[PDB]
Design a binder for this molecule. Structure first.
Ligand SMILES: NC(=O)c1ccc[n+]([C@@H]2O[C@H](COP(=O)([O-])OP(=O)(O)OC[C@H]3O[C@@H](n4cnc5c(N)ncnc54)[C@H](OP(=O)(O)O)[C@@H]3O)[C@@H](O)[C@H]2O)c1
Ligand SMILES: [Mg+2]
Lengths: 758, 151, 152
């Protein structure tokens, strides 16, 4: 399992230990700032906090900061490895808190494992945190410890999964009963494996208006019903049905309606599902192996409402569904705790979303969302731009309804505006591209097949099933390099090799190249020499003929050495007379794209307009709404240089061609990126918020800005340089492109070849 | 460009920082033959003539200038060690766009700028969006420069 | 064929650059009586024992002229003109005769970059000879300078 075991063992800790880096969000680059932070000047915020404790969440963390406080006794799915020893998956849980909702997580881990001193230590560390994210407290001391801890602090004491997925689970129940046009009054339930996140879930499920006598709790030891054991089990006898001689699970169905269970191995069978009433609602939430094998049961019976917790299938129950967003409702409302109305109004938001999901800048191409409410869609997919702006305000609204909050939110229009603004700056458009490429792999030429980076990328693409690689190079050198690198790919089995020499199609290749380039300075002998010594020409001829769907070159040599071949063979797209390369950056303002960093040295107004339109179309296909800003050293007519006049001409041309495109210019970079500066300068600007597409006057400015920002102000690699305006799918990369860049660009080329590769 | 490079190096030296200059271009050490890159190479030669002790190299990319691993991969024998703290740009458009984007994206706080070099007397032209901290810092810099023969 | 003639007349000690296998089969097919080592030395463009010292010198020549170390390595395997020029510059050969393939300036750029200009000379020109009715006639700069100026 080294393709996952070793790959995950290769953990991103190498630059600086720990995914979290406690760092100043404020400037600390001047003695004034340092004195404001540790010298007289920092005594004032502390004194103001001491005067009235109302200022605790304001001047410090503890506003956005949760602490996933743990004794390391059930580390996600690991168990009792320890507080300090739990740090890997501790940080793994804490990193999908900031990543998806911007939750600060102090990964402080309580070393006290006793079920009564652990609470003492946690309550001791209460003032550090504005809401604890109690996780890895194991069963049965999870319920005991959480019950003890809820009653002490005056700040949101919200456990993990124990409170947890009940919101997602009960939302899924509310939607599933909607699917089969049933009612909560008469629904019957079957629960198996009363574990940490299982036995506490029906308690919420009851809160919807559910009678206790309809729930049948079970564990490893048969069925937990009143009459089975002389000593009635706590928190389970309320639901416990009268004794009726039902000792086996295969008969206790009697036409039930729900299978809410968060446990381990399988307990349900196909005949068990058959004994269920009409329209079964199996909800097997087991992560290792689904308790019903959904394909088998669906072949046994149709119209299934099977719900799981794995992302391979729709209706996935992750923590990111509401946990970061619960605290985005819990901490951002000022609550002193989380009630059951908190836990139930957020049920009415994510359940509402599944049958009220639409628009939200669907990826015009790529992605392949194809999400409609029904038997295969009960709750939204794990990651959603409004999984926040619907669930977090639900929790806050429940906070004010419960009257337990200390900082009630004002008019929700402003709250929704800020939440959506935060939404724009965090997008993961590459995951839909990977998903869409995986369901229809195409043949991609990699002309630099002997490169170590290209070989690693080939291994990754074979593993993820994104493409059918076609390497170009000497098979001997490729094989020895593969063996030395340690890869598990083989010729023919995983990737096709095209030998640059002794190619059986040599005659038909150089002939086509000559017929393309006979009147462009290439003789027949030069064509023959190019189809043996220029792998880019071989790949381009392969793609043009039809033996491959896309090409990914550029990892060797200069950009234009490959782009000239690409343009000569494929040509320009229909209705397009220019090409441009778009580079993506993850700035603090969000995903930003810089247009024509590589192709045109000094584009003119018409070329700039074409590049702007192509960049907007490409960014639209990513699922991001294009917000273009033409950049210059002049701010809205400040200078009369030919460059600024060219930018204004391009703006007019773009407005002519695409009246619906949000674009403005020419302006400065800060005016484009921050809205306050632009509003001060141009209050009537057609550009709203931060611009995500930056069109530059010349290639020098674009390249210098991108190179400086990538090493200074950038998080990770997504795509770039995305070549636009060529007839066939091909992306010329750079010699310093990483393996991740190559894999992402190959996936993008595969998805573009799924859309008429011409 | 050579005069600007020398004045910038002198000013950064007066700040107490060792000047490490890198002339920036879209070409990485002769990759392109545009007049801009040739001008950058000419400026590099002129600077090396005028100030043999100044640590400077170019023309290169921004990432090659800022991170040493990229430069060592490209030019193992580069006269520039570590990260460059002075970035000389081919034209005002590239310089202004890069500074404006980096200031709002990748920047902590305000220290100084735009520091005017080459005028007889101490004077600094600021921008209409300059903050109070920027004005105070620039006034202090002008005061200190006037303590050093304001002519 | 020219190598056969030069071996026969004893005018030069040829140093061919190419794949020894292809060279030998082409020799056998053509009907020539030359053999590797016996009459002419072969330098294999791939698996050359002096590969490391060759691309290193090419890089040191062209590091600030747009050529990276990997591009230098790729040129000393796929560009025979670069191999021959580096050979001549090092001293392992005395002269080069290229240009029978490709464009004139593709080879002249390599030649100028490696060898440079002569001392006291800032330009290059190609002279072509003709046997006219008036005698031997030479036409100056038919290949190098597109639009020379007065000094050139
Ligand atoms: N959101 C998610 O996807 C998510 C979140 C959390 C957990 N989970 C899944 O839930 C399970 C454990 O999570 P947890 O920490 O909440 O619970 P846990 O504390 O690990 O307890 C699991 C329970 O399952 C029961 N069990 C074990 N083997 C069984 C068998 N052969 N037959 C019947 N019952 C059996 C045990 O009950 P006895 O003590 O009576 O044996 C045990 O208490 C794992 O499968 C995990 O992947 C999924
Ligand atoms: Mg956990």
């Amino acid at each position: 399992d080294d393709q996952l075991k070793q790959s995950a063992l290769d953990f991103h800790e190498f630059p600086v230990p720990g995914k979290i880096q406690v760092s100043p969000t404020k400037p600390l680059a001047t003695q004034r700032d340092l004195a404001l932070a540790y010298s007289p000047g920092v005594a004032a915020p502390c004194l103001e906090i001491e005067k009235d404790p109302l200022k605790a969440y304001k001047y410090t963390a503890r506003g956005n900061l949760v602490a996933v406080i743990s004794n390391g006794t059930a580390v996600l799915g690991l168990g009792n490895i320890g507080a300090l020893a739990g740090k890997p998956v501790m940080e793994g849980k804490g990193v999908l808190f900031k990543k998806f909702a911007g939750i600060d997580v102090f990964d402080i881990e309580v070393d006290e494992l006793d079920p009564d001193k652990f609470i003492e230590v946690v309550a001791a560390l209460e003032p550090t945190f504005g809401g604890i994210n109690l996780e890895d407290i194991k069963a049965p001391e999870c319920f005991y410890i959480e019950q003890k801890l809820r009653e002490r602090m005056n700040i949101p004491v919200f456990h993990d999964d124990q409170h947890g997925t009940a919101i997602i689970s009960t939302a899924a129940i509310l939607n599933g009963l909607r699917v089969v046009e049933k009612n909560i009054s008469d629904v019957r339930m079957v629960v198996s494996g009363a574990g940490a996140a299982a036995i506490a879930c029906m308690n919420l499920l009851v809160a919807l208006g559910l009678q206790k006598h309809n729930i049948v709790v079970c564990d490893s030891k048969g069925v937990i019903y009143q009459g089975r054991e002389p000593n009635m089990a706590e928190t389970k006898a309320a639901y416990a049905v009268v004794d009726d001689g039902k000792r086996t699970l295969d008969d206790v169905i009697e036409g039930a309606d729900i299978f809410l269970g968060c446990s381990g191995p399988k307990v349900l069978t196909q005949e068990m599902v058959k004994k269920m009433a009409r329209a079964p609602m199996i909800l097997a939430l087991a992560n290792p192996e689904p308790e019903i094998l959904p394909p088998l049961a669906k072949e046994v019976r149709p119209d299934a409402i099977i719900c799981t917790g794995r992302s391979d299938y729709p209706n996935q129950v992750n923590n990111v569904l509401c946990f970061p967003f619960i605290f985005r409702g819990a901490l951002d409302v000022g609550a002193t705790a989380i009630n059951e109305e908190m836990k139930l109004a957020a049920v009415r938001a994510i359940a509402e979303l599944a049958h009220a999901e639409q628009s939200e800048v669907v990826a015009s191409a790529y992605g392949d969302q194809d999400l409609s409410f029904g038997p295969e869609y009960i709750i939204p997919k794990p990651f959603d731009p409004r999984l926040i702006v619907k669930i977090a305000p639900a929790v806050a609204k429940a906070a004010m309804e419960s009257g337990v909050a200390t900082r009630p939110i004002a008019d929700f229009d402003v709250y929704i505006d800020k939440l959506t603004e935060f939404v724009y700056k965090t997008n993961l458009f590459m995951k839909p591209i990977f998903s869409q490429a995986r369901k229809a792999p195409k043949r991609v030429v990699l002309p630099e097949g002997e490169e170590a980076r290209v070989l690693h990328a080939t291994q990754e693409l074979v593993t993820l099933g994104l493409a059918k690689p076609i390497l170009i190079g000497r098979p001997n050198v490729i094989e020895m390099r593969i063996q030395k690198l340690g890869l598990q790919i083989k010729a023919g089995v995983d990737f096709e090799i095209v030998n640059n020499e002794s190619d059986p199609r040599f005659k038909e290749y150089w002939t086509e190249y000559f017929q393309i380039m006979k009147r462009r300075g290439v003789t027949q002998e030069q064509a023959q020499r190019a189809l043996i010594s220029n792998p880019t020409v071989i790949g381009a001829i392969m793609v043009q003929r039809g033996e491959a769907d896309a090409m990914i070159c550029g990892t060797v040599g200069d950009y234009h050495e490959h782009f000239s071949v690409v343009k000569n063979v494929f040509g320009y797209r229909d209705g397009v007379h220019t090409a441009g390369a778009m580079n993506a950056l993850l700035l603090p303002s969000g995903n930003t794209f810089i247009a024509d960093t590589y192709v045109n040295d000094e584009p003119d107004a018409e070329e700039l307009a074409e590049i702007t339109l192509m960049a907007a179309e490409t960014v639209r296909r990513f699922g991001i709404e294009p917000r273009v800003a033409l950049l210059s050293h002049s701010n809205f007519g400040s200078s009369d240089c030919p460059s600024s006049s060219k930018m204004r001409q391009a703006l007019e041309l773009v407005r002519e061609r695409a009246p619906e495109l949000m674009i403005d210019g020419e302006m400065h970079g800060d005016a484009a990126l921050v809205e306050a500066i632009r509003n001060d300068r141009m209050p009537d600007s057609s550009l709203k918020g931060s611009a995500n597409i930056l069109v530059m006057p010349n290639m020098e400015a674009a390249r210098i800005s991108y190179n400086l920002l990538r090493v200074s102000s950038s998080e990770g690699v997504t795509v770039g340089p995305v070549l636009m305006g060529v007839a066939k799918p091909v992306h010329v990369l750079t010699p310093i492109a990483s393996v991740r860049r190559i894999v992402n660009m190959v996936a993008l080329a595969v998805v573009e070849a799924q859309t008429q590769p011409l």
